[PDB]
Amino acid sequence: GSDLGKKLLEAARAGQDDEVRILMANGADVNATDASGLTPLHLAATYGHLEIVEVLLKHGADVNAIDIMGSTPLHLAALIGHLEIVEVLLKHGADVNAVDTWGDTPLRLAAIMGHLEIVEVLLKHGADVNA
């Protein structure tokens, strides 16, 4: 039979907000992970799907879920450059100073990418310049 968690990951990545809600109401685990540890929240945060990020969080998504590389959804939003998603993640308790496998924080990632508005937001939320 079909895997609801795999469908939830695909709906979160595709930006299908109606399907995300339906899947979860029918038993899809909000914290379903693929082979690399990516959750629906990691995918919605990467693809810039703000409403899906908010829906996932309201349904109990782990805001600080880490994949095999230690990337939290905040790392992914800061790297790509989704400002409103960074702000929503921080509001829901994202670890501003989370360090991935390469020793990078969301602040480092936003800085190297030249995402200055995100840099300022992270710093205002307690990003440690020495982490």
Author numbering: 11 to 141
Sentences from the paper on this structure:
Here we applied cycles of randomization alternately with selection steps in order to identify higher affinity binders. This strategy led to evolved DARPins that bind tubulin two orders of magnitude stronger than the parental one, resulting in complexes with subnanomolar dissociation constant. Biochemical and structural characterizations demonstrated that the affinity increase is coupled with the destabilization of the ankyrin C-terminal capping motif (C-cap) of the DARPin, which in the parent DARPin interacts with tubulin but needs to undergo a rotation to avoid a clash. This remarkable order-to-disorder transition illustrates a new mechanism for affinity maturation.
The structure of TM-3 could be determined by molecular replacement taking D1 coordinates as a search probe, but only after removal of the C-cap from the model. For both, there was no electron density for the C-cap. A comparison with D1 gave an explanation for this observation. The longer side chain of the Arginine residue at position 118 in TM-3 compared to that of a Histidine in D1 led to an interference with the C-cap, hence to the destabilization of this module in TM-3, making it mobile and thus invisible in the X-ray structure.
